[PDB]
UniProtKB/TrEMBL annotation:
Domain of life where this protein originates: Eukaryota
Ranges where the JmjC domain occurs: 140-303
Lineage: Eukaryota, Metazoa, Chordata, Craniata, Vertebrata
Secretion signal, residue range per the UniProt entry: none
Name of the featured protein: [histone H3]-trimethyl-L-lysine(27) demethylase
Full-protein interval shown: 801 to 1266 of 1268
Organism field: Homo sapiens (Human)
Amino acid sequence: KDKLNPPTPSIYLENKRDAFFPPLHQFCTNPKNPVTVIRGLAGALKLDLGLFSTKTLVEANNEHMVEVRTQLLQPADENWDPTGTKKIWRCESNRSHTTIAKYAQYQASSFQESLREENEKGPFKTIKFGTNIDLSDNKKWKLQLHELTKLPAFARVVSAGNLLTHVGHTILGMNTVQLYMKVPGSRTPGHQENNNFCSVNINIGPGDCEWFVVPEDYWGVLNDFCEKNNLNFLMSSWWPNLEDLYEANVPVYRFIQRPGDLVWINAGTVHWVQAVGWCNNIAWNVGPLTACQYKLAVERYEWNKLKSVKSPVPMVHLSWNMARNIKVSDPKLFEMIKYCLLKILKQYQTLREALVAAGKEVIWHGRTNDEPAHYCSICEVEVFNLLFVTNESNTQKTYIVHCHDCARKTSKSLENFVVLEQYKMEDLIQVYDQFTLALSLSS
Ligand SMILES: OCCCNc1cc(N2CCc3ccccc3CC2)nc(-c2ccccn2)n1
Ligand SMILES: [Fe+2]
Ligand SMILES: [Zn+2]
């Protein structure tokens, strides 16, 4: 169909007025738009993209760590097996480390070498992609992070309307910025964002990137291709065959992101990306306060448990922080959060009563304010409020956390464990009771 290659939802910005215009964030967060490309964003805001140029990064922090992914230079939009006889989904990539200075040399010499070649089915060249460069330290990247505060509020790393701001602690690469340094053919394999949170990506240039996007409600189709072809959807590297997708009637959005264009990946959108030239990119996540974002984040949280995959966003901890500190005026969002909190509260009361009925002591432990969420040291599930810690770890004050299930499996009557309580039931009951719909006259 004509419907399988739809146009890209695109906003064309000329000036600051266009950037701060409220219908912009409404357009981005609209679930009908799986991706929005905000063209001319850097130029409209007079953002200095030079602060993220390779030359400036080397000057700034030359020994800064870079995760290198070594990949094959594949033709156009295809992915061929090593031999060059068939198109396959699987893509191979080894990981190593280098520094900004060393990767910069490679990026620069790669460009010089292509100029020289320009003046002179397999097999494929090997290229290196500089990935996951951690721009979290404000003392190392002061000017860079300050430049990003010039964005409109809805797209910033930190803002009142961002769920990831309400988490109350750092989640690396989600509420901190990551940088990517690229050469032609540097590929980002197919994926969804952590816990289906929206992402913001700005191309620093000077080259272009080519994006491929499938709406969230088709992710189950791609999951099936992965299972059929012996791939883990969440954990393997794969590059979809567009003819497979065409055949299965999956619509594919496809577009070029030029320097200074911002790409908004909406909640749960499946996407993959390749550099067309030499460029850098910066990216982070944002969680808009919408029913759709919250719903998709909870669904993925629950799906991750089934797949034994850690959720980077602690949705229980987050949901309590929303109830404590956010006046929520959307009826559909409010009812989702309320329902979730009730589930948490009931499950916690059931467990706590079973412990007390078995004669197991619950130790008041409290909590430092701003203390991060805890995860089970064995299975990596989020553990809320009741923490299971071995007698020895308790004595040593290391407080290594287990979930109830993992503690039970280790020690059948919990004889090896103490149960630590970080919040009184009465306090949580009140936060729940005092969490009510705020009236708003807007839509
Ligand atoms: O525009 C730049 C950013 C493109 N987006 C990327 C790149 C990337 N890199 C690491 C993954 C990887 C593995 C193997 C080969 C290549 C890559 C891509 C880099 N990882 C992610 C990511 C990871 C976890 C959750 C959400 N997103 N997003
Ligand atoms: Fe990503
Ligand atoms: Zn566990």
